[PDB]
Amino acid sequence: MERKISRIHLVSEPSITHFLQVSWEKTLESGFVITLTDGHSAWTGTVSESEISQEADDMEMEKGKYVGELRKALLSGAGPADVYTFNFSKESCYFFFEKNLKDVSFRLGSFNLEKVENPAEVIRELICYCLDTTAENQAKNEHLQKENERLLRDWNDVQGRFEKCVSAKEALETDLYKRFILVLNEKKTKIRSLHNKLLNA
Amino acid sequence: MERKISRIHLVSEPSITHFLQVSWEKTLESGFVITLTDGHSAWTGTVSESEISQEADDMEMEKGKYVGELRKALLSDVYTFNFSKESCYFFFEKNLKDVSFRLGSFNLEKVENPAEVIRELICYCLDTTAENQAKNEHLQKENERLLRDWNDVQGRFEKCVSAKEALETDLYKRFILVLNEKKTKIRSLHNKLLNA
Amino acid sequence: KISNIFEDVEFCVMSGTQPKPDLENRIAEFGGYIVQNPGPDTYCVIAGSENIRVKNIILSNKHDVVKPAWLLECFKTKSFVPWQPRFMIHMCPSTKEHFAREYDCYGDSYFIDTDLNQLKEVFSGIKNSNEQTPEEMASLIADLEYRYSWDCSPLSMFRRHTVYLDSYAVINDLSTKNEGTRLAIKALELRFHGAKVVSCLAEGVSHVIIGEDHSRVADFKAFRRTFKRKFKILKESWVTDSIDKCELQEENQYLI
């Protein structure tokens, strides 16, 4: 049972921010509930598996495609390209939203909202969930950033140690050789001297 | 400009949730704005740099565990909030084991947009939340990549150490055979000397 | 046909088949005679691989058995290359004694200084043997560095240390190993610079190395009251600081 609060702007209200909360179970295509609010009031409504299918049919558009568009419009899924438009009458409580492509506006779907009776309260619930959300993602960030640090220091550290070790190892054989030759040739100094004295014996 | 947001209760209304929000500029010490809401109405209050440090003087105290008592008590079983909408007096007091005493109390003065205030605050969450999500995704893929590499260097360093261990052993093994042959020879000749 | 350095020289080629009849053919185009089994005038047998006639020819000691690479320098130099240990698979008594006057049994002169070249070549015929245990190699190595003052060499900086790294959530319990740890990398560094590293804390470890988790420190110091030989407990940064200045820092800085 996912939900998704997304902040929008109404065409009616250029400067004033508004919040769209959708909510469902996990598809969008199975239907969804849909509160708007502005701080100060709160409107709701429900869409259904089949209303969606009909809407798509109206647009002569393949169903995955259409739901594609729905997620991007309703869930802040928008690409850089994508421009979406949101329209609401307080008065008629009608919600429609559209996409804007080659300077045409293409309606993407509509809603019947029903102004809500308990306003300051669903606002409460809403904005408790956001505190919980922001706190979770905060804490997960603190953790990921600390692992990132750990990891970056430890990778830098093996890289250097490792390469210093590959050099030393590559110079080792000859190095041993050289230590071995001085020792054996000192032995041979001693062989020569004893042998010569034995000659003179 | 720093800030911090915080769910609370009042004893005045035990059964529901409110929000206190504390904002300040580069420190809590410059002074600060503080705001409270039920989800419906707008309460605000400005307590700044001059009567901030006059608190710890009319109490003679370390700003230290005042300032720090407040920030524990404010920026987030046992503080206790009480406010009245008519006066605007907001007080809190530190509740102890079998004593109790007084901690703080703004004489607030509320404002006219209960929406402009709920707007900044829902936004804050969403902006702060969406920002972290992006970073968390990048960090997460960065960290899998750093661990992969780390694991690879580890396996190549393991082989380089085995190779170094094997290279010495093999080479000492063939040294000690040859060195020994010089000492045995040195022994004959020494003995054979002493005898001629 | 192509030469006669070998003319009037009789050869047995037993192995082979670098191939037994190739070489007999080649011998034969250098003027030389082949003979199916050895005899009072055969000059030497040639010996590519271990074998029945061969293994046996060695067990008698009439003949003296030489590697195919000798003939191939003769063929390549068009000359009758003097025998050098590096050529001999086995020596008949008379020839053994002639070469035991100037040379080791591996081929090092008694009397003439070796070389990089010349000793590589000596080293180059031996494969060992196993006659040697890691613990064993260690001491031999260690005493030779001590003998020769090689014991401060970096790559040997730690031979004398026997070290337990705190890599197990339960001391000495191999199945509690914490893997992919800064401490896993310290075992590699210690081993690479000569250390003996041990997966078991027991009498004879001279050092134990902690990183950031001190959770087992007190178990260690508790273990060590029961030891005779009283290990040190050291910080990981001991090993790094020692390797970074290419010699032992030491220890009392890094205690515990």
Swiss-Prot record, chain A:
Changing residue 65 to E: Strongly decreased interaction with NHEJ1/XLF. Abolished interaction with NHEJ1/XLF. Abolished ability to bridge DNA. Abolished interaction with NHEJ1/XLF. Changing residue 69 to R: Does not affect interaction with NHEJ1/XLF. The chain holds residues 1 to 201 of 336 of the full protein. Residues 1-201 are annotated as: Interaction with IFFO1. GO terms for molecular function: DNA binding; enzyme binding; FHA domain binding; identical protein binding. Changing residue 71 to E: Abolished interaction with NHEJ1/XLF. Changing residue 62 to R: Does not affect interaction with NHEJ1/XLF. Widely expressed. Phosphorylations by PRKDC at the C-terminus of XRCC4 and NHEJ1/XLF are highly redundant and regulate ability of the XRCC4-NHEJ1/XLF subcomplex to bridge DNA. Phosphorylation by PRKDC does not prevent interaction with NHEJ1/XLF but disrupts ability to bridge DNA and promotes detachment from DNA. Monoubiquitinated. Changing residue 102 to E: Abolished interaction with NHEJ1/XLF. Residues 131-165, 184-201 form a coiled coil. Keywords: Chromosome, Coiled coil, Cytoplasm, Disease variant, DNA damage, DNA recombination, DNA repair, DNA-binding, Dwarfism, Isopeptide bond, Nucleus, Phosphoprotein, Ubl conjugation. The modification Phosphoserine is found at residues 53, 193. Residues 180-201 are annotated as: Interaction with LIG4. One of its GO terms (cellular component) is cytosol. It is linked to Short stature, microcephaly, and endocrine dysfunction: A disease characterized by short stature and microcephaly apparent at birth, progressive postnatal growth failure, and endocrine dysfunction. In affected adults endocrine features include hypergonadotropic hypogonadism, multinodular goiter, and diabetes mellitus. Variable features observed in some patients are progressive ataxia, and lymphopenia or borderline leukopenia. Changing residue 82 to E: In SSMED; impaired ability to repair DNA double-strand breaks. This is DNA repair protein XRCC4.
Swiss-Prot record, chain C:
GO terms for cellular component: chromosome, telomeric region; condensed chromosome; DNA ligase IV complex; DNA-dependent protein kinase-DNA ligase 4 complex; intracellular membrane-bounded organelle; nonhomologous end joining complex; nucleoplasm; nucleus. Testis, thymus, prostate and heart. GO terms for molecular function: ATP binding; DNA binding; DNA ligase (ATP) activity; DNA ligase activity; ligase activity; magnesium ion binding. GO terms for biological process: base-excision repair; cell division; cell population proliferation; cellular response to ionizing radiation; cellular response to lithium ion; central nervous system development; chromosome organization; DN2 thymocyte differentiation. It comes from the Eukaryota. Residues 1-88, 153-256 form the BRCT domain. It is found in: Nucleus. Keywords: ATP-binding, Cell cycle, Cell division, Disease variant, DNA damage, DNA recombination, DNA repair, Ligase, Magnesium, Metal-binding, Nucleotide-binding, Nucleus, Repeat, SCID. Belongs to the ATP-dependent DNA ligase family. It is linked to LIG4 syndrome: Characterized by immunodeficiency and developmental and growth delay. Patients display unusual facial features, microcephaly, growth and/or developmental delay, pancytopenia, and various skin abnormalities. Severe combined immunodeficiency autosomal recessive T-cell-negative/B-cell-negative/NK-cell-positive with sensitivity to ionizing radiation: A form of severe combined immunodeficiency, a genetically and clinically heterogeneous group of rare congenital disorders characterized by impairment of both humoral and cell-mediated immunity, leukopenia, and low or absent antibody levels. Patients present in infancy with recurrent, persistent infections by opportunistic organisms. Interacts with XRCC4; the LIG4-XRCC4 subcomplex has a 1:2 stoichiometry and XRCC4 is required for LIG4 stability. Component of the core long-range non-homologous end joining (NHEJ) complex (also named DNA-PK complex) composed of PRKDC, LIG4, XRCC4, XRCC6/Ku70, XRCC5/Ku86 and NHEJ1/XLF. Additional component of the NHEJ complex includes PAXX. Following autophosphorylation, PRKDC dissociates from DNA, leading to formation of the short-range NHEJ complex, composed of LIG4, XRCC4, XRCC6/Ku70, XRCC5/Ku86 and NHEJ1/XLF. Interacts with DCLRE1C; the interaction is direct. Interacts with APLF. This is DNA ligase 4. The gene is LIG4. The chain holds residues 654 to 911 of 911 of the full protein.
